[PDB]
Design an enzyme around this catalytic site. Structure first.
Site, mmCIF file in Angstrom:
data_model
loop_
_atom_site.group_PDB
_atom_site.id
_atom_site.type_symbol
_atom_site.label_atom_id
_atom_site.label_comp_id
_atom_site.label_asym_id
_atom_site.label_seq_id
_atom_site.Cartn_x
_atom_site.Cartn_y
_atom_site.Cartn_z
ATOM 1 N NE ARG C 102 -3.951 0.464 1.842
ATOM 2 C CZ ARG C 102 -5.199 0.558 2.297
ATOM 3 N NH1 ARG C 102 -5.492 1.389 3.288
ATOM 4 N NH2 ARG C 102 -6.166 -0.139 1.712
ATOM 5 C CG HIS C 129 -8.393 0.012 -3.061
ATOM 6 N ND1 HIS C 129 -7.538 -1.003 -2.725
ATOM 7 C CD2 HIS C 129 -9.111 0.279 -1.954
ATOM 8 C CE1 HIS C 129 -7.732 -1.346 -1.473
ATOM 9 N NE2 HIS C 129 -8.687 -0.574 -0.983
ATOM 10 C CD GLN C 132 -12.934 -2.619 -1.117
ATOM 11 O OE1 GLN C 132 -12.181 -2.430 -0.176
ATOM 12 N NE2 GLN C 132 -14.016 -3.368 -1.030
ATOM 13 C CG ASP C 225 -13.870 5.746 -1.390
ATOM 14 O OD1 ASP C 225 -13.812 5.603 -0.152
ATOM 15 O OD2 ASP C 225 -12.839 5.726 -2.120
ATOM 16 C CB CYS C 265 -13.873 0.721 -0.358
ATOM 17 S SG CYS C 265 -13.525 2.455 -0.156
ATOM 18 N NE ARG C 293 -9.835 -5.512 0.014
ATOM 19 C CZ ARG C 293 -9.207 -4.481 0.559
ATOM 20 N NH1 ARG C 293 -9.872 -3.436 1.072
ATOM 21 N NH2 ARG C 293 -7.886 -4.490 0.573
#
Lengths: 307, 298, 308
Positions: C102, C129, C132, C225, C265, C293
């Site tokens: 990340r 991402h 996700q 988001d 998310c 996930r």
């Protein structure tokens, strides 16, 4: 009697040879030894930042069947809330070995004075003995017998790598040269211990300010960063004295045609070592980093069965 | 239908005996119970520093076959980016239990109100129940039956250890005394809950400023650091003088870390009454028993 | 063989993404049935930024494949400072069988993947991402079955990592993706064009609109988001007023298909991009989405490891 590994000479020449042979065997069969199955715990404590030591110990312990409890610099530095001796006594109730990267060697000595499990130096101000076990495994797998080889270290002659290459190198029978500028020479006590150990193995100790003389005929050239975090405010120009000692192509050309180059990493490219040397055909730095895993697994197996 | 362990009295006297029995079984055979094999996960979250709790839970969970996800206080504080209820819901999808060291008890209550897995207090400002389980295991293995024993705690009577020794002690049938100066006495509602539980077990609660009276005839003498400002506590130092007043074969406990020369002297802490190292070891065994017990009831 | 990485959603072809998503369903049913990392073999999991879902899901998922995650978080010195990213990637490749990272700029992920001898996985970057969106696609498939031809609308900042990955990953699955965002906050043109090209292969489509009501109408899936990332907090913009019309609230959800589901998310800022009523109501799939996930990333790792 509990065996610790706080400095390279904690192993006799014969014992060092046993650890390096196990390292070769474990490199070949990395999950064949499960002394820590259960899992049993191992403490892996970092008072300073680490990448290679962190990964190699955490995974190596797991591959011995154990579970590493990794303590970061975010936790309160040990010795603030209770004595290091009290910490060693309690950790000895949870884990089968204590691996610790710290500052002063006296801190390691304090824990080893009372721990009922092996204490292993994962880097101190004075020594980096697990790095040199991996260096020796790397040299052996590229050159064979270690006895009689000529190894030169360049840079700060009083740092942990210089001290452990002296002690660990002469234990293996290697002729060790430290090339360092005036005022940056090995600790006299460490130098004397290496000279005594060298008498036993046919090795020798040389300390010189002449970088070209140190490079000539060497089988192995080693360097390390010139400045630790604790020295950045010491008031010295820590660049100008060391430039003659940079491990560059011209210096490497002076050594034996088959010489290899080591560097414990992280490297500051363009300072103590150049891109051409570190990425060239003499560089063994990536195998050297890998062998941290294997050499430290062998050390743990060896200490655990003798403790 | 989901059981949590946020305070010592969350276990009844009978259930505490079950957990302590399991603790002795697991100390003898530390990998004989594998309810978390897989591995299944357990969250171990620290809002604040830890050595004994971190090692004991992380390795205990591993020895139950599971994998502890250890979240450090260096990581962003819990409940800062989303509600604690949203965090509890998400964690419940990844792990089978949530172990949490925090400050306010109301934070633990918020997590436990929504989590669908057991929540365990790994130390709060108000209670340290897992430490007292380990203390009770240590007393039992040295003295046998707990019921009727005399235990005295010395020092800061208002902290988490004083509260948990009160609650966990009377749950085990122990006559508990807190020896503490005025201004550092147990929280009244904790003391009231302990006196209430004590009626069921033959136990009792005493709070006194007289360290000599508290030490006289004690079977267990316990202390803890004074601050979490030292003048009020000096008369309650657990030194050789007080120990000389206790019952024969008395045990000395200290949750650690210790400030040697303050709440306890080297002579007491390193002497033959001291059980502080077995006590610390038993954090591992008692917490594994607690997790086994909570998981099979949840 | 070549080394397969997963830095952006389109790194998988439509056929390959379908394989990963099938594996995700199989691993959800039987979570310890695949042990490619038994040993244990190592996987690096490095966080230059904070995380709860990615941290828990990767660390446990790796363990359930038999492996051991070495988790490096933000208290350890940030990668790139003590030595080059290339040196780090070479060293890690000697210890682990994959690198999960990340980080910030996509070019940092590109740099490790250029030198690493093991798969590199983007665990969230400034630009994408993708792990996700794999979990999102697994969740949608659980609820609705076939993904091809579904209509998905994302609301909020159209240029952030979730908008870009919903575009790329969505059309790779054959989903008609709409991004509903205020003017000035639109998808990166190169991501939009890439998603348009990929949609042509799957019969999907890309729509970008400032009309939130039109984007909600008829949608099978509504997604949002947070509007502002940490790096944007000081960008000088009012980052509330432009996005209020795009809030995923009960009125917006009522315009979609009567069986539409809602994704987010996490973490959510309740009252901003989504309301309590929507996130806690019967259309919300956010908790299953978070759980997936674990499963989808395990599937991804199995798939990449068998091809590398």
């Amino acid at each position: 009697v509990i065996r610790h590994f706080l400095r390279d000479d904690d192993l006799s020449p014969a014992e060092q040879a046993e650890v390096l042979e196990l390292a070769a065997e474990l490199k070949k069969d990395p999950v064949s030894r499960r002394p820590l199955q259960g899992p049993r715990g191992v403490a892996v404590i970092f008072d300073k930042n680490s990448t290679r030591t962190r990964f190699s110990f955490e995974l190596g312990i797991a591959q011995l069947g154990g579970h590493a409890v990794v303590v970061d610099s975010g936790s309160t530095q040990l010795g603030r809330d209770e004595t290091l001796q009290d910490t060693a006594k309690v950790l000895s109730r949870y884990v089968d070995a204590i691996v610790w990267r710290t500052f002063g060697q006296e801190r390691l000595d304090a824990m080893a004075s009372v721990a009922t499990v092996p204490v292993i130096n994962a880097l101190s101000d004075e020594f980096h003995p697990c790095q040199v076990l991996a260096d020796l495994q790397t040299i052996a797998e590229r050159k064979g017998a270690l006895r009689g080889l000529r190894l030169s270290y360049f840079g700060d002659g009083a740092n942990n790598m210089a001290h452990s290459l002296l002690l660990g190198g002469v234990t293996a029978g290697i002729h060790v040269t430290v090339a360092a500028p005036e005022g940056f020479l090995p600790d006299p006590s460490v130098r004397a211990a290496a000279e005594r150990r060298a008498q036993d193995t046919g090795a020798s100790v040389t300390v010189t300010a002449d970088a070209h003389a140190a490079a000539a005929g060497a089988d192995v050239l080693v360097t390390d960063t010139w400045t630790s975090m604790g020295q950045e405010n010491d008031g010295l120009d820590r660049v100008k004295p060391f430039r003659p000692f940079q491990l560059n192509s011209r210096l490497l050309a002076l050594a034996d045609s088959d010489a290899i180059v080591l560097h414990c990493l992280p490297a500051h490219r363009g300072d103590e070592i150049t891109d051409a040397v570190m990425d060239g055909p003499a560089s063994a730095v990536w195998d050297e980093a890998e062998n941290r895993l294997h050499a430290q697994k062998a050390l743990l197996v060896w200490l655990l069965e003798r403790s």
